[PDB]
Amino acid sequence: SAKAISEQTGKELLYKFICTTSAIQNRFKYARVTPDTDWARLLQDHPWLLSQNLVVKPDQLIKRRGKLGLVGVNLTLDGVKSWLKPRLGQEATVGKATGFLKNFLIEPFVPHSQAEEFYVCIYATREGDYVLFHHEGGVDVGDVDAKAQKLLVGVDEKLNPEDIKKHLLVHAPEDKKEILASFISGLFNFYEDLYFTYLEINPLVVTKDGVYVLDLAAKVDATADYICKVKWGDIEFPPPFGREAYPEEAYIADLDAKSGASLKLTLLNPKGRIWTMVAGGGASVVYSDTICDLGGVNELANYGEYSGAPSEQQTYDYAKTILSLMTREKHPDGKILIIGGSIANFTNVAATFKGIVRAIRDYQGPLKEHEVTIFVRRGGPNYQEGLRVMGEVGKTTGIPIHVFGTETHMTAIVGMALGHRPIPGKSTTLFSRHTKAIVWGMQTRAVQGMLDFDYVCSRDEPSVAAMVYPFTGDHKQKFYWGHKEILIPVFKNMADAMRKHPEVDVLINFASLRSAYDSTMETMNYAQIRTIAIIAEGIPEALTRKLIKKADQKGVTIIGPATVGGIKPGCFKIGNTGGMLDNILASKLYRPGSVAYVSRSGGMSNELNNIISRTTDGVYEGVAIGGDRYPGSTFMDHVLRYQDTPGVKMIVVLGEIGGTEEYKICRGIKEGRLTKPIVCWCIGTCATMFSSEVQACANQASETAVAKNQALKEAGVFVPRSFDELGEIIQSVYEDLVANGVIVPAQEVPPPTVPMDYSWARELGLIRKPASFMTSICDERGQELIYAGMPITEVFKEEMGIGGVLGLLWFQKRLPKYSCQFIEMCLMVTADHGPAVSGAHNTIICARAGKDLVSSLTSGLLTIGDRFGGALDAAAKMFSKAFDSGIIPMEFVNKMKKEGKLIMGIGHRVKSINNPDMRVQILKDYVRQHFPATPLLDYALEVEKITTSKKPNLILNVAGLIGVAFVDMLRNCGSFTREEADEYIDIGALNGIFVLGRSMGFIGHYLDQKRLKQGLYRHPWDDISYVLPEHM
Amino acid sequence: WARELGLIRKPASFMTSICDERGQELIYAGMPITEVFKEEMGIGGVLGLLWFQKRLPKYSCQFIEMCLMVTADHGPAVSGAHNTIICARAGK
């Protein structure tokens, strides 16, 4: 939307980005003075104010400050000091609002008269830009709209100087006419390039010295920041002149910019009783109007809404913030919290309500003593399961939770809250049963919903003909016809999709705000598409106007941006309109009706669908034009389209603050263009009973909801007194029409079945599917990596080395430090043993064959087994089986000798006693020094004594030492049961130790062969004995 | 049960085109194994069905088989034969 900016920001933008032939003075010549800043620094870094006269103004968004006495003229430096004292720092009320003053601006003075002051204005409208010039400027203009010279500029064209001369600048002297003609053109160029929507200079001084701007009011489009963020620097949006934003209120605005969700909150008086946290913008407006209509004008405290499919954290923060701001007061009468909302279509009801459960779970102490009663009502995707979660959680906590579902009226909770009710070239047709649609984007949900509509409406032709996703090639995607297989075709470019079926008539775009404009513009180039529905919210207003004008000249109807779309029961739906499957079944939207409605909000359109379904034989078609200020189609367009449809019998109009569209509807009714019975209601009637409204932008009393409702009521429109009676009046008109006989209610036909998504079926807990895999070593699903129950940050904090991580991953145990260090030593010892062994040889051969690291390492590793690399495991098993039996080492040696088995882990080629193996010596020294008990190592050393008595070189090997010491570690460290250690030896933990250790050496060998640039190896023929058969 | 009643959608994560074993008949690329054997499509024909999903002409299948035979082995001195021999002598 459009937001007003400060005077200084507008002035600096004008100075930096102006392009005109006029002489520009006061360029970067201004100073911002603040109550809480160093004055000495201000006159030190910027002393250029010491030369000429100074003018001081307040820069807190003050309108018509000239007559208020806040404008100081002819001030000296000491004069400025004396002038700022009596008003700066405290309250200075204006009109009906109250607020302080903590920001002022000072500029140089120029001597001039009223004849040199002129009024310049530009403001953006649906048809382009209206520019106003007034020669008798200053603060004497008064009424301006019907007095100043007005010129219209169409969308997407330049402003020629001669039009300014002979149609805009008529009452000025020629000498200054020549300069103003170019100055206004440059001003318009600056306005258009920076994406401003409202620019105001009053007054403007022009003289032989140059052009001076005394006061400037600027309203710019925030949504177009991505077009001018580099050209805006650090732009700020000052709040309207009033009470400063609360520290918790601005937190909601901070959440607003986290994602595409809408998160707004405003405060008037925190001392009130009624508090609302209603989901959805339009739903929140309706709820506020309902509460203020029946006696909540002043007792309401907050005004907040949340929509746009907020996530878990966003809704959690919103709820905790609103409750925290709720618990700063004690109300003896009592406290209530109305949270309602319309029927949601895209917002995840379950996630948001789980978030507010988590937010209310810990906010129970500082709320129970404040006697807070919560009234909950909602509908949408996964509403009932979360609703019963609310029921059970509210029963568990104890606070009064009043749960109302879809079956109850939207505003009934408000009625029971205060005790008022006891507590219980366009075309007349756009979509048809044969309509084909192209969905642009990675939006599978839209296609699924449209296709499910095609089934529940008993259509023999899918409404979705193509999918366009530029970042993937032409392919086919899984879907069902009935319950059998179909494939939707997904294309890269729009041209191919348009050509492959030219009968497609409607396109619905789900592209983000960056590419929505370009995609829509390129879609406009094909005459097959007759209706384009834009779903993105946040498109710049100028680009939206360009799209609207191009569609109007192309004859293509538009569903305006910032909406969920529309639904035609029995024929067609746009995007996520109508909600999920069971809501379509409940709202009875799978058969055509006789009454049609038009609105702006998305979810509240589904609420109107529900109201009509409850009180009328069904809906024929409903369209939401969007929340942007310039929707592609207005209310009047859809009203005429419904009027030209014979199937439609009643018209419903449900808008809000903004525009004079209802006056146009009344005018069309009076002169005989509209004849069908019409029920209309303008929400926002409470906007006059609040302090200031932000979520629109009414200018006069004519654009007020109450005035529009009255003008509709006494013009031939069935307007109820409020939204509460809207259902009753609609039902009464339906009864009158069926009593007349124009409407013949057809009998119901049962809808067919359509399959349900597995993921959201699994979320509801409706399906059991057994897990095919079981893991226990690592968890990566959470926000932190987990190693056997131990977080990675805790792994590194505890200084668990490679051995500690190995223990966690292989044994799921927190091993003692000496165990981890012994594991690392074992890895170091087995790291490599030269290139001559089988595994190193195979790795070297594969590396010299040009293969990558993985293939060479793998080729080497696959030799590890019984003859190579299996000595650790064999030695451990042999010594463990000997020691577990009662046999003494001598008996073990004799028993091995009898069976013709060499004791695995004994015997070295060159090392003997009085010539120790150094690797064995290091490992054995560490094991003796640090291990608590080494029974198997003692047994193996006795066996070594015997075998060395037999023959000197029969010493305990590296393999035997590592095996027996690893058995001792697993068995006598206190982390394993004896059965656990036995199982870990049995399943091959020592094979893993050897393989992981020798992988280092094998990778080193691969890197060495690559670095040495060794060529392909072929074994010599003379080293091979060829003994082949002679004839066989 | 839900899949049998056809009220649950879960997309398949794998796609295949060469062999179907679910049915009463083993099928190589849309051809039953009985028809594979009764039409004398040997190693080459099965290879064409499984690798290219085509019924190659008879001479193509025989040429594929001849290519397999000529590359069957080239002595123990080459790298792959050397590694296979060494891994075999390691008891694997």
Ligand SMILES: CC(C)(COP(=O)(O)OP(=O)(O)OC[C@H]1O[C@@H](n2cnc3c(N)ncnc32)[C@H](O)[C@@H]1OP(=O)(O)O)[C@@H](O)C(=O)NCCC(=O)NCCS
């Ligand atoms: C194919 C190509 C490698 C020919 O190689 P070459 O250098 O002519 O000969 P080789 O590499 O076979 O070996 C040369 C000698 O080593 C001998 N030799 C080959 N393998 C041996 C082994 N395992 N032990 C001992 N000697 C061997 C050969 O008998 C030959 O002996 P000679 O010098 O007495 O004739 C060469 O032309 C080329 O690079 N061509 C590119 C096309 C290609 O790469 N084709 C792949 C081959 S199917």
